[PDB]
Amino acid sequence: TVFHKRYLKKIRDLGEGHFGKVSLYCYDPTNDGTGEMVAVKALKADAGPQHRSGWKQEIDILRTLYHEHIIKYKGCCEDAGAASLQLVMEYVPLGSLRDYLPRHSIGLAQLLLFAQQICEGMAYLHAQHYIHRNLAARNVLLDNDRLVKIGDFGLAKAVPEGHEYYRVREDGDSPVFWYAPECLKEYKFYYASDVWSFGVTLYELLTHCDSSQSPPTKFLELIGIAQGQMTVLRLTELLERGERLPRPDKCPAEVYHLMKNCWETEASFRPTFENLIPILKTVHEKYR
Numbered sequence: 254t255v256f257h258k259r260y261l262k263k264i265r266d267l268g269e270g271h272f273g274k275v276s277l278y279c280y281d282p283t284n285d286g287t288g289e290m291v292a293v294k295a296l297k298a299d300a301g302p303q304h305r306s307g308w309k310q311e312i313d314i315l316r317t318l319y320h321e322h323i324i325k326y327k328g329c330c331e332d333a334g335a336a337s338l339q340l341v342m343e344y345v346p347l348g349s350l351r352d353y354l355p356r357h358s359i360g361l362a363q364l365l366l367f368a369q370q371i372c373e374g375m376a377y378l379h380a381q382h383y384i385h386r387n388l389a390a391r392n393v394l395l396d397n398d399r400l401v402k403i404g405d406f407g408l409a410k411a412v413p414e415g416h417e418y419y420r421v422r423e424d425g426d427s428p429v430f431w432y433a434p435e436c437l438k439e440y441k442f443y444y445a446s447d448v449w450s451f452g453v454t455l456y457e458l459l460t461h462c463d464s465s466q467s468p469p470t471k472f473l474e475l476i477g478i479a480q481g482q483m484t485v486l487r488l489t490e491l492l493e494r495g496e497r498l499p500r501p502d503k504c505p506a507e508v509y510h511l512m513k514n515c516w517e518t519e520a521s522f523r524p525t526f527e528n529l530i531p532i533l534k535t536v537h538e539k540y541r
């Protein structure tokens with residue numbers, strides 16, 4: 254599907270993704286105003302060949318994905334400036350859980366329904382042989398009080414049929430506070446590594462995305478802020494010692510133990526996303 258830049262009317266910027274900025278546009282070819290609202294992700298004009306090859310890969314990944322709990326790909330727009338493609342996706346009206354939750358006190362049952370929906374979208378992604386590599390409350394978009402969607406595939410990679418992991422590189426933009434120890438130490442990203450990040454995302458939802466309770470805040474309190482180039486090493490060490498993010502207030506102990514199971518140091522001891530679906534359906538049922 255192809256969108257024309259001449260019909261895209263910019264409303265406002267939505268935020269910064271991984272390779273570039275996301276903006277809210279009205280695609281109005283009739284010029285009346287009845288045009289559909291679209292979220293357009295664009296690659297920065299000054300970006301090198303390293304980001305350009307990754308951006309094209311992000312587009313191809315989202316184009317091949319079709320799930321009710323994954324952001325709907327709408328099409329691409331020919332960006333004459335920057336000589337690249339603009340990723341046109343659906344506008345998810347309520348936005349990110351990182352932005353929504355601190356302003357809207359959402360009940361425990363709805364938060365568990367969101368976690369269940371995340372696992373549903375993630376089991377699909379894993380069945381398609383892809384790893385997300387950036388599962389966080391910031392990347393989970395809210396369509397309505399009962400529907401959630403995974404939104405940023407900038408770090409998403411395809412795991413080859415024979416392999417069970419993807420070898421990652423030393424990057425400053427890596428979401429380390431959402432990463433399993435094997436990612437930090439051995440630079441390997443398994444399907445089980447996305448389950449660690451889910452556990453962290455579940456923690457964020459149960460804290461209502463309170464920035465003072467956030468994973469970078471809580472981990473840096475244990476590490477310290479004057480550790481030179483050793484923040485990640487110190488993070489790897491505390492996780493190896495069995496230290497974890499604390500139990501959020503009003504979080505049921507059962508739910509916290511499920512979180513701790515998503516955070517097993519041993520990747521094989523962790524549940525798959527397919528294992529978490531009937532578990533979270535039952536837990537949501539208990540609290541509804």
Ligand SMILES: O=C(Nc1ccnc(NC(=O)[C@H]2C[C@H]2F)c1)c1c(Cl)cccc1Cl
Nearest residue numbers: 267268269275292344345346347348404405
């Ligand atoms: O693409 C993003 N957000 C996005 C996409 C589609 N619709 C929305 N909706 C809204 O932002 C709602 C609040 C009103 F603007 C957000 C996005 C951004 Cl930018 C930054 C990081 C991660 C993601 Cl997923």
